[PDB]
Each structure stands twice: as C-alpha cells, then as structure tokens.
C-alpha cells in the first residue's frame, strides 16, 4: 500500500501546469492510443495485399506504389506518437531520480513542450509536403522499370481520408493546446 | 489496501445520479463492449476480401464496394462506443483534479449527459440518413470507371441485419435512459 | 488485504440459494467459458472459406450459404452466453449498491432466475424450430438469384453434430438445475 | 496479505492423499497444459488446408476427410483435459463451499478419483476402439458421392504418430499413478 | 507482503549449488525462452507453405519433405526446453512440500542434475544422429509412391543453419556447466 | 508493500555511473523496445511472401533471395537488442545475489559497459560489411540453380532504408553515450 509515493509523484510532475488543460490533453492522448490501437491497425492490416495495378509486368506495381505512397500512413501516426511521448518519458524520469536525490525544473519542462510543439508541428507539416490530406482512387505513376504510366486503384480511399481529417483535427486542437500551455507559462514567467 | 479511496471517488461521480438506472447502464454499456470485442470483430474480420462482382475490369469492383459502402460497419460503432465514452473519461479526470484540489460540478454533469444525448442521436441519425437500417443481398452501382451498372453480392447480409436490429435496440434504450436522466435532473432542479 | 469485503459480497449474493447446486452450475458455466473460448472458435475459424458449392455463377453459392445458415453457429451460443449472464451481472451490481447504501432482494432474485429459464428455454426452442440438431453433409437450395438447386458440402458435419450433441445435453441439465433452483424456491415460499 | 487462507486451502484439499505422488502429478499435468497450449495447436493450425486428395469432383475430398478422420486429433486431447480437470474444479468448489460453512469429505475425493479413472480410461479405449494409435500417409475411402475410392495423402504422418506416442505414455503412467491412489486409499481403508 | 517467504523458498532450493554459475545459467535459459517465444515462432511460421517440389504428381512432395525432414525444427528445440525444464519443476514442488512438512535433499539435486545432464547429451546426440547440424539448400528423396528423385528446395537455410550453430554453442556452454556442478558436488562430496 | 527494497536495488545497481545519461539511455532502450515490438514486426510480417521475381524456374527465386539477404532484418536487430540485452541481465542477477549474500562490483560494472560497446560497435560493423546501409529496389543474382542473372525486385525499399536510418542514428548515439560512460569512469579511476 505504497500508492500515495506515485500518487505524489503526479503531483509534483504536473504541479507546474495549467489548472483545467492537462485534463482533456490526457483524454484525448490516451484516445489516440486506443483509436491506432485498434482502428487504423485493423484498416491497413491488409492494404499492401489489397494493391494492384491493371499492368501486368512484374515489378511496375510494386515501384509505382512505392513512389505513390513512400510512406505508409500507420507508419506516420505510429512514429509522431512514440517521438512525441519521448519528451514526457524524459521528463518523468527525470523527477523520479529529482526526488530520489533530494530525498538523501521549470526551464526543463519550458524545453519539453517546445520541443513537443516543435515536432508536432514539423510532422504536420512534412505530411502536407508530401501528399497534403487530399487523395484520389486513381493514382499515376512516373518510373523507368515500366512504360509510359499506370492507373492504379486504391483500396479504401474515402474511409482513410475520413480518418486523417479527424487526425488532422485532433493535431490542430493539440497544437491550439500546447501554444496554450507556452502561454500561460509566459504569462506566469 | 488503499482500495476505500477509489470506491470513495466511484461513490462521488455517481452520487448524483439515478438510484436505480446506472446499474444497467453499465450493465448494457460492458455488454456493448464484450460484444463488439469478440462478435462483430469476428464477423467483419474478412469482409472486404468477401466482396467481389461478377465483372472483370480492374478498378469497378473497389469503387462501386467503396461507394455502397463508404463507411465500414464496424468502424461506425467503434467510433461511437469511444466518442460515447470520451465524456465519461473527462468527468472521472475532472472529479479525479477536484477530489485532489480540495485535499489541500453538477452543471458539468448535466453538459456531459446533454452531449452525450447529442452525439448518440446524431450518429443514429446520420446512420439512417445514409443507408438507414435495411439492406440487400444485390447491390446496384454507378461510377465513371466501368460502364452501365454492376450488381454485387454482399457476404453475410442477414447476420449483420440482425446484428444492427440488436444494436439500433440497445441504441433505443440508451436513448430512452439518458432521457430518463435528463429528467430526473429537470425535476429535481 | 481486502478481500474479506468482496467474499462476504459474495457470501451475501449467493446466501438464499441451494446448498449444493450452485457449485456445478458454476463449474458448468465456467466449462462452457472455456470450450466457448477455444473449441468452438477454433472449428469455425475457415468455416466460410470452407464452404463452397460446385456451381459456377457468381452469387448463389453466397445465397444459398446464407439461406442454409441464416445464423452462423458459434454466433449463436455467444450471444446465448453473453445474453444469460446479464441478468448475473445486473443482480451482482443491484447488491453492491445494497450493501454500498445500508454501509451509510429475494423477489428480485426470483425474476432473474425465472427471465433466466425463460432465455434458455427460448433460445433452444428457437434453435430447435430453425434447424432442430441434426444436419447432412450435402445441402439442397431455392433461390432466384441461381437456376434450380445446387447441393452444397459443408465442412466438418460430424464434429460439429456431435458438439451440439453436448451443447444439448449440458443445456438439458442446466434446464433441469434452474427448474430445481426454482422449486427450492418455491417450496421454501 | 491473506494467502495463508488460500495455503491453507490447498492443505486441505490435498491432505489426504499420497505423500509423493502429487508432486509428479501436477508436474505432468501442466506439462499437459503447456505441450497442448504451444505444440499441437502449431501443428494442426493448418491441417485441415493441408489435406487435399488427387480427385478433382467437388464433395468426395471433404466427405472422404469426414469419413477418414470423424475426429479431430487436438480436439479429442482438449475435450479429454478439460473433462478430466472437471472433477477437481468440482472438489475444491465443493471443499471452498465447506470451510466457508464450518466458518460459521473422504468419500467425496474417492468418488472424484474413480470417476477421473474411469473417464480416463474410456477416452483411451474409445481413441483405441476408432482407429487405434499408428497411421499411414496414404488413406483409402468409401463413399457414395464419389465412385470407386480415393487415395488421400495426410499432411505430416510421422511427427503427430510420434506425438500420439509421447501422449498415450502419459496415458499410461497417468493410469498408473491414480491406481496407485486408489491402492493406497484402499489399504488405508 | 508476503514475498519473504518465497525469497527464502529460492534461498533453500538453491543454497547447495555453485556460487557464481547459476546467474549465467538462469541467465541463458530465460535467453532460451526469449529467443524460441519470438525468433524461431517467426522463422518457421510459414515454413510447411513455403516448402515445395518442382514435380507435379500429387502427394510425392509430401512424403518427401516428410521423409527429408521428419522432425519440425521448433519442435525438437520445444520439446528439449520443457523436458529439462521438468526436473526443475519437480525438485522446486519438491521443496515446496518439504519445508511445508516441517513446517509442522542433497541426494535428490544430484538426481536432478544428473538427468538433466543425460536428456540434453541424449537430444544433442539424436540430433546429430539424424541430419546432424549441416544443411543444403537442394534435398533428394527416395519414396515409392513418386518415381525416380525429386530435388526439394529448402526455404530459409542459412538463416536457421546460423541459428543451429547458436543453439549448438548454447547446447555445448550449458553442458560444460552441468559437468561443473557436478565436478563442485563431486569434490565437495 | 514492499518495494522499498526494489527501490534501493535499483539505486545500488545504478549507483555507480552518470548523473544525467543512464535518463535517456533507458529512454531510447525502452524506445528500441516499442518500435521493434511493433513496428519492424509489422513491416516485415509479410516479406518472405512479398518477395517475388521474373523467373518461373523453380528453387531459383529462393536461392537468389537467401544470397542477395542471408539475413533478415528484423532478425539481426532482435538478435542485437536481446544480446546487448544480455550483459543488464547479468549484472542485475549479481547484484542481487550480492545483496543478499552480505544480507547475511566496480570492476564488473566496467567489464559489462566494455563488452556492452564491443558487441554493439561488431554488429554494427559486420551490418555494414555485409551489406552496408543502402538498398535498391532491383537486385542481381549469381547462381548455379538458374542460368545468367534475375533481376528482382523488393518489396518496399524506401520504409526500410529509413528504417535503418534511424536505427544507425540510434546506434551511433549509443556509442556516443556508453564512450561517455567510459571516459566518466576512467577520469574517476
């Protein structure tokens, strides 16, 4: 029954933050967690497989998917979240040992959401630079292994693209969000 | 054994509420939840390598699934259950901050039943509004990419029917018992 | 170490029942969580791909499967399960909040039990009218959608027969048990 | 901290028996549990796929699969645990039920022993009875729906022998070891 | 907190061994359960598919990769694991029981190590005797029910050849312990 | 409740060594973790099928696919991780049999960091040896099996390369950071 050592733990690593905000910021973090634990992962669970292409030369489908879609899009989500919860991973172990040692900081977390904003924001925009969030069934294709150029059909096209507009939402109130906490703290500061 | 702190917090977010009605709302919400865990997930698991058509030409086939189906079944209620449950999840956050801020509220709940009302009633609506609740076996198409119309075969049309005949019930119901609390609320107030 | 809270919980909520009963009705239900969990799901893991029919034109064989299946079995005995524990959980939750509201009952247990008998006994009455419980290897068909009839081969008749064999008897016997439940009520009132 | 109670349970449950036996007992039994748990469940996951015949009538490869194996291998082992680990659910509900009442025996556990015997032995002389213990790769058929008879090849002949003869050796010693019970229950009687 | 108990239950089964070498052992055998859990499970996922002839006549491919491969890989190297990892299992309930009783040994470790040391010398030397542990990518076959030879082509050789000699080192390294616990127990005794 | 002597295990393993480092190293090692269990697994899940080449001769697309990648991927970096893995293991078993024994370590501690960077600075030296860390899409072949050369071509080049970038660049910091530790050692000793 050691449970208040963590529960004060919370309390000392989110002391320093907004009174209403973390709230939500948490809710809607932990909705990502379940919505690619489970939606987009059983969407492209079978896209590679569901590509093709009306050609019939072997190794154009494959080259021309490849230059249509250079990244796979869970891929993408899976990455921005994992890189973006590494800051919180950081700083957390960093209190732990904080109060282990005083048991025998603000600028720190100052730099932990800058950082969050920073990569938040570069990963939205190095997604519009690529493709955007707008995206057709029928996709050209520009490479040498096969003539001229091919048609190819995307397998789910209007369902994905529902999903990245909600994505693209939740990525937006999260930056609404962050920019909140950067000026609160410069408010307080 | 620090167990009485969280039954105190659950006799708390659910002091003002109905006495009798919560019990099978949580009742009926965790029959939702293994439901759609083992069931549906079960039926849909191999649905879309089901779909074909009786035409040949690349491509026809993946629009006229996509434009008949522009949203896949599952995917509906799951993003119903979380959004549902969203609320939820920021009132037990938000009582969680107050219990601790005072170790130093009700018109919040009735703005979490009132949207709750309003996302579910929307997403019904919007369910009927685009394919309502009764489907065929054949299905017609119209799409530039192939010619004239392709009638396609779906896998498993009555199980499903039956299926969302269930849950457009427990929908009902929910409908039904929210309102049962709203009112509560409005005579009590 | 607060465990003796929960087992006087369930010292109350099984007080008013028969002395030895209870005892293998939850062995049996436990052994049909089990068999429920891997027998079953394993056998119709390919039932669909399985089934085929030696006509070629596209959609009857898809018709004709759903017509001589309306219900996939294991759809079946899940949602009987899931559907005859609800009125546990509800009756469990119902004497929790007891207990939680004297911390500051025997006709409700009757009705469960009773709705209980009543959902069994319709769920095999219904079972029984369908398709009874006993099934041959080919299959004859009526539909429109394909010319005269196609014999069709299920997959794995005998295992299949032979689990609804026990399926069968175990319901029988739970039948009977509910039914002394029942008496011993009745006989006590 | 109250697993003295459940210690104590397990005192009681198993004081008496064997001094020895026990031990090897539950030994062999989860390795049971771990054998069929990992094993077998990898080696017939595609059984039923692998299996095809060098006819090409549409019926006569899955009736003569039917006819050749009515049962499944994994599913005649998984029936026999949990059937033979029912007795034992039964007799520690029944010993839990009993301490919970002189809170406020012998003949039991010899009946439990025989009948575990007993299952045990008709599962090995039915298993005996259908098709006895060793197998061929090549398998003929008799059925109507196809003419004269099919030579059917089976997927992996020799690794399953081997492991029926690994499972009828526990067999024997599991035989064994409850005789050995039972001898000693009756000489201390 | 209760964890005193089993720490000295761990104290008592290994205090008469080696100092330093039993860190290593455990070490390498929960390596062992590391590697076989992800690495091996993955590498012969698919391996019976992947296997084929360039022969066309049916069931000759697979008496062939029958006769070429009479054991599964995985399936020597998971039975190896769990048969060693018997006796520990048995001396630990051993143990368990002991100090139980006198709660109201040196000869039987011996024992233990001794069989320990014979099943792994035993399964290496099988191994060995069989196709010893070098492997070609082309395999012959001599079977009547196909005529003359077919060349088979192997799916992955040098990946699980460089996996053999891993687990042929480990085989050798956890030999040269055993024989160390013995030679400590020897010159102690 | 007690973790205090977990805790003060920790704190004695980790006592000896860098004020702000071991933070991020086990950040990044707990990195490592995620991504390799979900994202390498995902990529690689289907490749071995993906893998496919112009030539209809049998036997040469396997062997020209063992030569042109002797190793898998995902392979050579689970192998990596639990290897590098396996040092933390066995320290943290001689601490707490050290810890124990005076219940009734520099020098190690070097050695565990120096073969930590030996291993690691190997596998990355034989990664780039072999093959480097750049790939193309199509690929040659030498063989005895099939006559000239096939081209073939690989199933998603871009995702892995930058995969592997990433990887390098993790791999380069965890030399930068354990050559930290050295250096730090080395001016205090």
Redesign the interface.
Known sequence: ????ALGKLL?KVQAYSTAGGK??L??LF??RI??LG??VE??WG?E???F???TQQ??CE??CY?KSF???H??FW??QI?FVS?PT??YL??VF?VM?KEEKLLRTYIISILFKSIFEVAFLLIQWYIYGFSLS??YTCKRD?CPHQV?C???????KT?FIIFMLVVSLVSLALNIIELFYVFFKG
Chains 1, 2, 3, 4, 5, 6 share one sequence.
């Open positions: 029954g050691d449970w208040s309390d709230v939500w948490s809710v932990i909705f379940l919505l489970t939606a059983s969407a079978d590679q497989s569901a093709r292409c009306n072997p190794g494959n080259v490849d250079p990244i796979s869970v891929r899976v990455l994992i590494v991973l950081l172990a960093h040992y282990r069934a029928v292994p048609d059909f995307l397998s789910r096209p209007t369902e529902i």
